[PDB]
Design a protein around this nucleic acid. Structure first.
Ligand SMILES: [Mg+2]
Ligand SMILES: [Zn+2]
Ligand SMILES: [Zn+2]
Ligand SMILES: [Zn+2]
Ligand SMILES: [Zn+2]
Lengths: 1221, 640
RNA sequence: UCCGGGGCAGAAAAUUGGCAUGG
RNA sequence: GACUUAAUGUCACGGUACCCAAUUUUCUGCCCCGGA
């Protein structure tokens, strides 16, 4: 008779706004969603409504199931022979049904005794309602022999509570890019998945068939189903306003974006980061200790979390970060809004009857493949911003996160049925080697092979059992010209952890299991030797979404024989995890394991089409330099107060079903892909062009355009050497030192936490990239050339790569004798009776040449030679490079509390100096040599009074701000903020010589105690406001370190322990070797760089702590110079380079370097007399410690204007080696 | 303000794009750049912009719409997108405000275009109301604004009284002959002057590219005339079809897929006109019907008929077929005793035609038939075949019976004389029908082949020594001594087929085959190593010129059941015909080996295929449907 | 008339922008 | 009950939110005169 029917969904079912049939044609969204769950507003305001399922839709699904059921059972059910039915309403006979069939109708040979009429009809006609009183126009509910009532949702009801709006896609197979898209409301299948309805049947003869059809409805409303028969946001925004206003008060408004990023990433740290105050304490903190409305930011966030504890920690952090971002955008000139000008193609889609008659006796069956998709790489399933993802809702405001990963209603990661189905369809089209681009709204079904398979294939929307927040990758685009981040190129992508396993269901309903479908399933399986190849989701080019389909277990319902048990078990729809986790014996009655799964190499479509589709090239980069892929946003959140840290991935481990305790350090697949793309576009010059439309460059075919996918897909460069290093991350300190003031600028001190890569203990980063089938021999050779270019160290990986970071040691699949006269006073004073100042000044001049023709980084220009110099550091006097990672490295603070004792700089136990220090010293020497600007300058610092430091400095001498006005030679070669440097200094590695300086005075041998190192005072250099700035500050090469050695005990006793420092110190004659790479380098530029490295036989450099004390003076020897367009340049061509650099210098002025007076002054500042001049700093007065009697060499004598005139003092400070006494 | 200067620069860019002097390829780019400037300004000012800035955004969107030429069948989604966005933005401009008149001008032109491409979204009554709003808001300035002429012509076409602006409409220099004809016909009803102006427009059509919107506009005008039962629609359709013929003779082969295939309703309209006009004059009209039918058949394929350049062009054609992006003999020349049945499936009406020429009698005559039921039965056969190859035979027989039921004239003695060899030139899905195996709707009906030795030809333009056989078996008769030196029996050596020379008088490609319903250009002959396909046949193999090719491969002559944008065959057998093969015996679907080998037995090149098919199971349609299905699959293609 | 003294410990830039369909 | 179904015809499981982008660029863990 009449029975209540419960329709339970088991994946998010599609929903669309209910429209009346005539009014439905107006809206194409509801026009398409005729098979969706209908939603009708229950009241005014478009807020709350009621969701139902059209009884005509359940009826259509039921009659389709009856068609299939009778077709399986040769046109009979329970011994009752049905006819083929009627699916053709003549227009003259009556009005057409509201829904017209556009699909093949399963038909059979008619075995009915008589034609079907009102007096008696087969159960198929009864279920169709062919000969009942009710017709195409509804009048009464009692006129239906079969009646399918509306199915009301069983659980006023708001739309956002039941459904989430989502944009789907239609991805072109040939180009890999979506042709168009459409939006549907995926409703919750857990809280709102059950729909109650009524089905009335007054013709009991068909009853059994109807019930069977109810068991055979595999899917409904876009979801697998079983058909059984019975506001803190406002307060958070206010707090964001107060926080941002307080930041604006301290002129830290721009820090609010960084703070929003940090707050969003705090969701990965849990509540404990705020309640336990796990944020960095500070050396207070530059961001977490900023005073907000009278309190520190960390305490304010603690109070906010306590007040906003109602919402979860994850939700609170995301909402606070989003509100801070939005308010920052409001205060910076409005919030950015997205608007696709032309291509925002939200596209939605001949009455004909096609009877298909399966042969009598054919066997049709159902194979349900169950498994787990393991994310072999960080997966990303794209979704629009949450504002766009609100059902029931023109500029769209860009939210905090540029790319969101689609998530379940409970924040669990989701693999959509649509995305997995599209990937399966693409792989099936590849396996067949022949498939259509899906046509929407076609009059008839696509009878192409792939479409037939897909019509026979039903998947399941899968949700991972892991709800922790996504990781964030901050991708950027590098400007090819300047090798800097492109303006506006920055976006955070939410990626799920790798190794996260999703359920996987694939039901095939058909006669014979295809060789191509089995080929695809074998393609996706990792097995033992191959790798999983299910490239689901998006960002496939950057190694996102390669899923290994493991734990594969095909089953089989023999539908012709086991149809009753199939209907009883509902095809195990919603019970597939049972099929994964149940024994072979506990299977349902009709389900038998499929033992005829063809093996991997026994499937011809797999071997011919799928196996060669993606060729994996896996290799290991050995990096003999520190590796730092910066994660500053994550650096702020976790403690240690590291300004920059190495990027580490959160990797899911299904063995423990949790994120791995130690994150895996890696160079991100985006960075790897960008390095390869830059190499290819530099060798081929493809990076040069600005437009890639209608374009077929080698880089365009290999890597893809805005309109075409990538034929090469790059995965992460995971570090496989984590266990090898005792201290994997080495804390490397850095600071910009003012070119005029020898002190450490102002706010320019910072730190870095790169992986401890060293030449003797290199980091091994094993990464792989996949090459598409059909790569040209030229393109394969070009990829090999790019890999070899990476091998030659052309492109370092990670941040600070031009300073000695991430230099590729490998991959695994000459002298000068320039004589300088020096200065008269030190040589003539053979008795060493003269005492000189420890530092002097270089007034190079007001004129500075700025090159507005900026050398590009987008190609290796042939006229400009790139290559590598090997340079031999020779220390002619003890050198000090403290390992400032541990200020208590020598462990002597027990005797002297508060003392700064550091070892010599070293990574992984081998003795080295940072390449950043080498670049800094060479850059100071180059700027002084080339008369370049004071690139680093403490303008904001004030002097004791008419104006500031910046006013005294010349306008031309100012640091180059932007490329519009050009850059000076120092900033052109070594780079600026806008422009990456074309010279890269590597970490000098110790080779041979006396390992340490040994002094018997110090109780800890090989260590030395320095004197007082105080900040230089520009007031002494600039006695009055009227007097100009002296110039670049340099130090002499003198043996004052000997004086420190003989007064070690006096220094220790007289100076307070916390005032001075102790260091592990080099000896005389120590030898290091460092590489210096260069790209697109002028001949005169290379000559000038070589001269600045090795100036002459007597000229040496100064490098390290203690330069005023005579410490840290080195000699550079170019023992080899290789170039490539790799040939070793002979010394003749090197001398030619230096000579033309001299010529360029002369042209600037308007190889004997002393001819030009400023260069002579610079080199006599670097002249090494050793002769033994005595050089030490003046004492305060005649009573201060360390005084020599009967000497005018005291600061009291040199401070007063009368005894020492200000002008004479200025001239003396500008005269190198000038006799101070 | 900054908005004023920004929008001034955008307006300057749009105006510089508007004039026809600029090249269209850069015109689109500069319109997009102007739209980018305007949209950036709109985003930076959010919802409070000057009204003229919103009007400029709408004008830019319309100018984008005007430069999106419709594709073969579907209107591009960017066209509808730009029209909708322009209408929305100009609505925002109208709500908050000689500038209002130009705002309503742009609004009305945008709505006119939207109604033309999407009539449902912009219905005719709403369009008429807004057009009246525009015209009462001053949208009348002609001779300076062509757009005002567009509103005037649309208004007169909707049926409002527009006699007041007729003089200003005609005196305007910037009015094309089609708008002039519409004005002369719709409000003044001057049929003679409308005829003169339409004749002028049709004459100008001989040079306008098929991508031009003037083609769609004139097709719409003549369609409206036909619906109006006007007396000028016949001549207009015929002359516009002559213009379409001469133009299509000089469009690019790529643009045949895109823009010439749009003007298929134009050919249907001309066919209807000539059919209405249809003793000697009547026969000339019948022959003109045949010419109209043949002009629609295999035009891009006809252009498919050094090596790397042609391979690249064929790849471009394949990408264009898949709707992808491309990166940048008279009809009376039948020989004596042969009857040619030209087919034409009119889509404007629900009828199809069967124009036939009897050479011996020199007689032309056509018969109409209803192809909707036959098309549904053919799609039934195709679906059952693609599901069950040899088990769909029954449906095939039914389809064959339908060809004898929808076309009983195929068995009329007065239509096709008995014993006359027949050359079919089918159209649309009739290309995929077994017209040779059609069963007359009579008790114990005989197939068409039995009475007439019937061969096929995709189009009449396909109609146009060595004396050794070069069989290329890749599957006994492989050791027969009649096989030539170049013949291969063990490995097909598809490269050898590429290198076959001397124009053999016959060769048999004994292998397998795949139709590739998704892409007929990769319809593959499963030869050795990589199987040779339609793409490779059109480029590599050149020896088979004047050859009599026999194709034992399965599905050699199988095409996607659904018709393309234009009527072309795209089969392996047609591929070999395109490289000069005199005749092809290609197979129309999957076949067994026994029947193919029996075909090769029939050496004996001069023997007609019909005698075979009669002898070996063809007549046994009631006896055994499978043997019928195995028999008829070998259609004969070519001209003696 | 006085005998000591640390400094910065990140600064700035970007925080998204595009997405060829007719030569 | 309606909200909310038409019934001899719903391939929307007919449609991967897809495609492009190097968290990077510059910076020597450095250094002396004054304070009441
Ligand atoms: Mg009924
Ligand atoms: Zn029945
Ligand atoms: Zn298809
Ligand atoms: Zn390019
Ligand atoms: Zn500079």
């Amino acid at each position: 008779m009449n029975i209540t029917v419960e329709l339970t969904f088991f994946e998010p079912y599609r929903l669309v706004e209910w429209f009346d049939w005539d009014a439905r044609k107006k809206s194409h969204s509801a026009m398409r969603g005729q098979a969706f769950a209908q939603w009708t507003w229950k009241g005014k305001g478009r807020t709350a409504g009621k969701s139902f399922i059209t009884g005509t839709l359940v009826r259509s699904a039921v009659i389709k199931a009856v068609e299939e059921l009778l077709s399986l059972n040769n046109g009979k059910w329970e011994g009752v022979p049905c006819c083929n039915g009627s699916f053709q309403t003549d227009e003259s006979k009556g009005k057409k049904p509201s829904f017209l069939r556009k699909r093949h109708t399963l038909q059979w040979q008619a075995n009915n005794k008589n034609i079907c009429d009102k007096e008696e009809a087969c159960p198929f006609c009864i279920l169709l309602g062919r000969f009942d009183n009710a017709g195409k126009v509804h009048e009464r509910n009692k006129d239906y022999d079969i009646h399918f009532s509306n199915f009301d949702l069983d659980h006023d009801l708001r739309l956002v509570d039941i459904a989430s709006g989502r944009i789907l896609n239609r991805v072109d197979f040939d180009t890999g890019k979506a042709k168009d898209y459409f939006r549907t409301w995926e409703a919750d299948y857990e809280t709102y998945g059950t729909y109650t309805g009524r089905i009335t049947l007054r013709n009991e003869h068909a009853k059994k068939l109807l019930l069977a059809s109810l068991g055979f409805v595999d899917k409904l409303c876009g979801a697998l189903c079983r058909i059984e028969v019975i506001d803190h946001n406002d307060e958070l925004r206010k707090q964001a306003e107060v926080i941002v206003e307080a930041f604006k008060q301290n002129d830290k408004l721009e820090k609010i974006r960084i703070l929003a990023d940090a707050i969003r990433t705090l969701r990965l740290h849990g509540e404990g980061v705020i309640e336990k105050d796990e944020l960095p304490d500070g050396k207070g903190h530059h961001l977490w200790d900023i005073k907000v409305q009278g309190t520190a930011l960390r305490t304010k966030l603690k109070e906010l979390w306590q007040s906003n504890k109602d919402i979860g920690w994850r939700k609170f952090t995301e909402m606070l970060g989003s509100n801070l971002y939005l308010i920052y955008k409001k205060e910076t000139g409005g919030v950015s809004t997205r608007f696709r000008i032309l291509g925002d193609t939200e596209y939605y889609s001949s009455d004909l009857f096609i009877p298909v008659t399966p042969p009598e006796g054919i066997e049709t069956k159902e194979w349900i493949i169950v498994g787990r998709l393991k994310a072999a790489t960080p997966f990303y399933f794209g979704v629009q911003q949450p504002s766009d993802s609100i059902p029931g809702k023109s500029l769209v405001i860009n939210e905090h996160t540029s790319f969101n990963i689609l998530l379940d209603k409970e924040n669990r990661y989701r693999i959509p049925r649509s995305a997995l189905r599209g990937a399966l369809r693409r792989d099936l089209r590849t396996a067949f080697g022949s498939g259509c681009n899906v046509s929407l709204g076609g009059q008839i079904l696509c009878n192409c092979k792939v479409c037939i398979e897909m019509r026979r294939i039903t998947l399941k929307d899968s949700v991972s059992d892991f709800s922790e927040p996504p990781e964030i990758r901050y991708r950027i685009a590098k400007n090819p010209g300047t090798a800097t981040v492109e303006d506006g190129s920055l976006f955070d992508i939410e990626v799920g952890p790798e190794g996260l396993t999703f359920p996987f269901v694939l039901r095939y309903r058909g006669h014979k299991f295809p060789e191509q479908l089995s080929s695809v399933i074998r393609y996706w399986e990792e097995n033992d030797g191959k790798n999983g190849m299910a490239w689901l989701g998006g960002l496939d080019s950057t190694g996102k979404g390669r899923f290994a389909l493991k734990d594969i277990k095909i089953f089989e319902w023999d539908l012709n024989q086991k149809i009753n048990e199939y209907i009883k078990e509902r095809g195990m729809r919603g019970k597939e995890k049972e099929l994964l986790e149940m024994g072979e014996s506990s299977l349902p009655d009709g389900l038998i394991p499929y033992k005829f799964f063809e093996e991997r190499e026994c499937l011809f479509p797999y071997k011919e089409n799928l196996k060669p589709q993606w060729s994996e090239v896996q290799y290991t980069i050995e990096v003999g330099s520190p590796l730092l892929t910066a994660d500053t946003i994550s650096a702020l959140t976790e403690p240690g107060n590291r300004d920059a840290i190495a990027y580490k991935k959160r990797v899911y481990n299904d063995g423990n079903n949790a994120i791995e305790p130690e994150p895996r350090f890696a160079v991100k697949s985006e960075t790897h892909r960008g390095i390869f793309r830059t190499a290819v576009g530099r060798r081929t010059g493809d990076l040069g062009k600005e437009d890639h439309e209608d374009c077929t460059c080698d880089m365009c075919i290999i890597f893809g355009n805005e309109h075409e996918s990538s034929k090469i897909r790059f995965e992460d460069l995971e570090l496989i050497n984590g266990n090898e290093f005792e201290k994997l991350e080495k804390h490397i300190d850095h600071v910009a030192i003012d070119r005029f003031t020898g002190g450490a600028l102002d706010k320019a001190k910072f730190d870095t936490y790169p992986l401890a890569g060293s030449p003797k203990k290199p980091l091994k980063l094993k990464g792989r990239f996949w090459i598409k089938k059909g790569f040209s021999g030229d393109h394969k050779l070009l990829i090999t050339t790019a890999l070899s270019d990476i091998r030659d160290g052309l492109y370092p990986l990670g941040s600070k790569g031009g300073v000695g970071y991430g230099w590729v040691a490998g991959i695994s699949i000459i002298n000068n004798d320039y004589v300088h006269p020096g200065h008269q006073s030190p040589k003539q004073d053979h008795k060493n009776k003269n005492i000189y100042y420890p530092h002097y000044f270089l007034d190079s001049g007001s004129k500075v040449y700025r090159e507005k023709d900026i050398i590009t980084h987008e190609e290796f220009t042939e006229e400009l030679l790139s290559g590598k110099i090997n340079c031999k550091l020779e220390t002619l006097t003890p050198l000090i490079i403290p390992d400032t990672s541990d200020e208590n490295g020598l462990k002597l603070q027990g005797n002297k509390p508060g003392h700064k004792n550091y070892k010599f700089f070293n990574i992984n136990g081998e003795l080295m100096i940072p390449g950043s220090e080498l670049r800094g010293m060479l850059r100071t020497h180059f700027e002084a040599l080339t008369k370049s600007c004071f690139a680093i300058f403490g303008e904001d610092s004030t002097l004791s009074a008419s104006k500031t430091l910046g006013g005294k400095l010349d306008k031309a001498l100012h640091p180059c701000t932007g490329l519009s006005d050009g850059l000076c030679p120092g900033c052109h070669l070594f780079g600026t903020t806008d422009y990456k440097g074309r010279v890269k200094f590597g970490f000098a590695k110790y080779e041979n010589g006396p390992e340490w300086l040994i002094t018997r005075g110090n109780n800890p041998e090989r260590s030395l105690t320095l004197g007082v190192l105080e900040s230089p005072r520009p007031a002494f250099s600039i006695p009055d406001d009227e007097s100009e700035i002296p110039g670049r500050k340099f130090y002499l090469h003198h043996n004052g370190w000997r004086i420190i050695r003989q007064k070690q005990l006096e220094i220790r006793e007289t100076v307070q322990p916390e005032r001075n420092v102790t260091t592990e110190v080099m000896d005389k004659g120590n030898v290091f070797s460092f590489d210096v790479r260069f790209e697109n380098l002028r001949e005169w530029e290379l000559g000038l760089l070589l001269q600045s490295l090795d100036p002459g036989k007597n000229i040496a450099h100064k490098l390290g702590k203690g330069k005023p004390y005579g410490f840290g003076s080195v000699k550079i020897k170019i023992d080899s110079l290789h170039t490539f367009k790799i040939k070793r340049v002979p010394q003749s061509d090197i001398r030619e380079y230096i000579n033309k650099g001299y010529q360029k210098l002369i042209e600037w002025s308007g190889p004997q370097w002393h001819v030009i007076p400023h260069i002579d002054k610079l080199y006599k500042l670097l002249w090494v007399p050793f002769l033994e001049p005595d050089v030490r700093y003046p004492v305060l007065n005649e009573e201060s410690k360390g005084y020599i009697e009967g000497s005018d060499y005291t600061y009291k004598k040199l401070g007063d204007k009368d005894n020492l005139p200000y002008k004479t003092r200025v001239k003396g400070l500008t005269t190198p080696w000038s006799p101070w006494n | 303000t900054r908005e004023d200067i920004d929008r001034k620069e955008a307006e300057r860019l749009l105006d510089e794009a508007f004039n026809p002097r600029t090249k269209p390829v850069d015109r689109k780019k500069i319109i997009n750049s102007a739209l980018k400037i305007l949209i950036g300004l709109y985003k930076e000012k959010k919802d409070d912009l000057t009204s003229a800035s919103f009007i400029s955004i709408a004008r830019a969107y319309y100018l984008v719409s005007i430069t999106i030429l419709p594709k073969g069948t579907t209107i591009p989604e960017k066209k509808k997108e730009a029209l909708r966005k322009g209408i929305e933005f100009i609505d925002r401009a109208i709500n908050k405000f000689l500038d209002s008149q130009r705002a309503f001008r742009i609004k009305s032109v945008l709505s006119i275009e939207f109604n033309r491409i999407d009539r449902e979204k912009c219905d005719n009554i709403k369009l008429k109301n807004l057009l009246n709003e525009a015209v009462d808001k001053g949208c009348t300035d002609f001779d300076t604004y062509e757009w005002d002429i567009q509103i005037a012509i649309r208004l007169c076409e909707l049926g409002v009284d527009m006699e007041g602006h007729f003089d200003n409409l005609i005196k305007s220099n910037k009015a094309n002959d089609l708008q002039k004809a519409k004005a002369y016909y719709f409000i003044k009803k001057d049929d003679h002057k409308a005829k003169e102006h339409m004749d002028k427009c049709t004459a100008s059509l001989k040079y306008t590219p098929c991508s031009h919107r003037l083609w769609d506009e004139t097709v719409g005008f003549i369609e409206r005339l036909k619906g109006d039962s006007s007396t000028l629609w016949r001549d207009f359709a015929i002359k516009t079809y002559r213009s379409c013929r001469v133009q299509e003779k000089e469009t690019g082969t790529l643009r045949l897929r895109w823009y010439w295939s749009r003007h298929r309703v134009l050919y249907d309209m001309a066919f209807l006109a000539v059919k209405e006009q249809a003793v000697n004059v009547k026969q000339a009209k019948i022959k003109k019907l045949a010419e109209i039918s043949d002009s629609l058949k295999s035009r891009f394929s006809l252009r498919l008929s050094s090596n790397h350049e042609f391979k690249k062009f064929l790849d471009k054609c394949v990408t264009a077929y898949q709707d992808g992006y491309v990166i940048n003999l008279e009809l009376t020349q039948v020989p004596e005793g042969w009857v040619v049945v030209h087919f034409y499936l009119n889509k404007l009406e629900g009828m199809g035609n069967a124009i036939v020429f009897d050479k011996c009698a020199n007689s032309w005559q056509y018969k109409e038939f209803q192809y909707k039921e036959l098309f549904e039965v053919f799609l039934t056969w195709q679906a059952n075949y693609n599901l069950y190859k040899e088990n769909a035979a029954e449906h095939l027989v039914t389809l064959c019976k339908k060809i004898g039921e929808t076309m009983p004239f195929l068995f009329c003695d007065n239509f096709i004389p008995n014993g006359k060899d027949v050359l079919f030139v089918p159209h649309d899905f009739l290309h995929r029908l077994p017209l040779h195996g059609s069963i007359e709707n009579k008790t114990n009906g005989k197939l068409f082949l039995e009475n007439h030795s019937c061969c096929y030809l995709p189009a009449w333009s396909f109609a146009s020594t060595s004396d050794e056989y070069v069989l290329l078996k890749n599957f006994t008769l492989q050791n027969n001594q009649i096989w030539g030196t170049q013949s291969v029996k063990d490995g097909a050596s598809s490269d050898d087929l590429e290198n076959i020379r001397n124009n053999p008088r016959l060769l048999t490609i004994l292998c397998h085959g795949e139709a590739n319903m998704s892409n007929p250009f990769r319809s593959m002959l499963k030869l050795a190593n990589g199987g040779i396909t339609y793409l490779e046949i059109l480029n590599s193999v050149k020896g088979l010129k004047g050859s009599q090719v026999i194709l034992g491969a399965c599905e050699t002559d199988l095409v996607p059941p659904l018709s393309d944008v234009m009527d072309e065959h795209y089969s392996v057998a047609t591929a070999l015909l395109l490289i000069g093969a005199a005749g092809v015996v290609g197979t129309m679907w999957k076949v067994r080996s026994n029947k193919t080998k029996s075909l090769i037995e029939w050496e004996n090149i001069e023997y007609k295929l019909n005698e075979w098919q009669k002898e070996t199971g063809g007549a046994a349609y009631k006896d055994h449907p499978p043997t019928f299905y195995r028999s008829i699959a070998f259609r004969s293609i070519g001209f003696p």
